[PDB]
Amino acid sequence: GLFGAIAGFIENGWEGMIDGWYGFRHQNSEGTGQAADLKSTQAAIDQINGKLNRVIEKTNEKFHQIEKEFSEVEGRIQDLEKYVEDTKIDLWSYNAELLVALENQHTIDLTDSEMNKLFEKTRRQLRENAEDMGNGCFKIYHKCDNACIESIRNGTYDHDVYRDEALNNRFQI
């Protein structure tokens, strides 16, 4: 994936996470959490839904066409009927093959992106109070209980409250 999150700096997925597509495993003083993020999961779902609907969109409708099977041998006109039918099937076959190839490549990059968006959104939300470990986890340099973790999750984290404490914890010799 073009963003190197899924199968990138995040080494693996979480077979435990049933509640959604993207989320948070945490570790603090008061224990352990694990919740799925709705806003990023939804985004990834609507877009894939949206693109599934585009592909499933009712393609056209024919009725009386040419005959496509023959019991007898006729030569020229029949030759032309078969060649028309064959090149038609070939071009559709290439369209179908190329469609999924493109779509799938994109679906992959779409989801990789959505994972990166959730990361950079959280990174900015934390400001100076945390550091990127490299593996998709931060180290929050302050006291951050389940109620604190929650505030990050629901988007309502105030970095000023913790700044003095975290900033100070981050620079010690």
Binding site: G1, I6, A7, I10, E11, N12, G13, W14, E15, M17, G20, W21, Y22, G23, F24, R25, H26, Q27, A44, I48, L52, I56, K58, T59, E61, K62, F63, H64, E67, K68, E69, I89, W92, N95, A96, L99, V100, A101, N104, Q105, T107, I108, T111, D112, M115, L118, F119, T122, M133, G136, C137, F138, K139, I140, Y141, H142, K143, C144, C148, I149
Partner: protein, 319 residues
């Protein structure tokens, strides 16, 4: 009070997972996919929403002409005409120069309404029957055709007209007789060399009959060749003949519609399925299909591939 905390971000994986084709990857595993190629069928044709006519043991041509065992199909109408493989002809032996085209153009018309017109056949005998085409107790002929023999011993030069005074097109189906022996030729038609001309103002076609033995088809060496002439509104149909003419009784109406024909042995069922294939009705929820290139209705595009997975989830990276 002195400690930190860890917050990890991540996505989900699955135990199973699905291989999928990408642009840089032949096969690669994702969280989930859906099949884009429809590759199975119910096995039977739903009677909806299309108007289906099961030809049972009649071909559209046999039904058209009026083969006695096809008498049920008089004035019939269809969206799809289904021809069954067990179909047989049981009338006078025949053949159609461009059989294919007649079968096609009538298919698309999607109607067998026959309007009988008062043609006058001066000085020739009508309603020629035959043992090769039985009608109940006695013998008969095609219902939409008039077999003309001679009067006393005189078969005059037939000169008849029928102008199209309506606003629709007319389809006339008429024939030419080819007797086995020169002995037969004269007994029915007098002149040992017959001739049929059928014409509009725009075009014409003259057929000269050809005497000689064909192989035994229903105890007969003789043949009837079937021909067709369409007459536009305001045009006229002229029929000439000094012999061997199989007269039309009238015309068939023509419709510009969405109707067609299909060879299939699939049963017919009570259900609704927009897309029909000779293998049976198929669902059209998918863009592509692998069942049969021959289709009718709002169908998926026929494609060579039997499977084609569209990723509906992220890349799957497991523990």
């Amino acid at each position: 009070d002195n400690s930190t905390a860890t917050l990890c971000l991540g996505h989900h994986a699955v135990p199973n997972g699905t291989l999928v084709k990408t642009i840089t990857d032949d096969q690669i595993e994702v969280t989930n996919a859906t099949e884009l190629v429809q590759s199975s069928s119910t096995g039977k044709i739903c009677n909806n929403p299309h108007r289906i006519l099961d030809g049972i043991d009649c071909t559209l041509i046999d039904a058209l002409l009026g083969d006695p065992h096809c008498d049920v199909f008089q004035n019939e109408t269809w969206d799809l005409f289904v021809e069954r493989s067990k179909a047989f002809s049981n009338c006078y032996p025949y053949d159609v120069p461009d059989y294919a085209s007649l079968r096609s153009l009538v298919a698309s018309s999607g109607t067998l309404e026959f309007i009988t017109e008062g043609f006058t056949w001066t000085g020739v005998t009508q309603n020629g029957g035959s043992n090769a085409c039985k009608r109940g107790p006695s013998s008969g002929f095609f219902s939409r055709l008039n077999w003309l023999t001679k009067s006393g011993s005189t078969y005059p030069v037939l000169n008849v007209t029928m102008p199209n005074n309506d606003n629709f097109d007319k389809l006339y189906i008429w024939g030419v007789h080819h007797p086995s022996t020169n002995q037969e030729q004269t007994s029915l038609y007098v002149q040992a060399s017959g001739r049929v001309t059928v014409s509009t103002r725009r075009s014409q076609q003259t057929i000269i009959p050809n005497i000689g033995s064909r192989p035994w088809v229903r105890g007969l060496s003789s043949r009837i060749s079937i021909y067709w002439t369409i007459v536009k509104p305001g045009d006229v149909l002229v029929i000439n003949s000094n012999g061997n003419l199989i007269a039309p009784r009238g015309y068939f109406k023509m419709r510009t519609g969405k109707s067609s024909i299909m060879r299939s042995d699939a049963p017919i069922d009570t259900c609704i399925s927009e897309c029909i294939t000779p293998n049976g009705s198929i669902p059209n929820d998918k863009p592509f299909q692998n069942v049969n290139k021959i289709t009718y209705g709002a169908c998926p595009k026929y494609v060579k591939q039997n499977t084609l997975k569209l990723a509906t989830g992220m890349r799957n990276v497991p523990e």
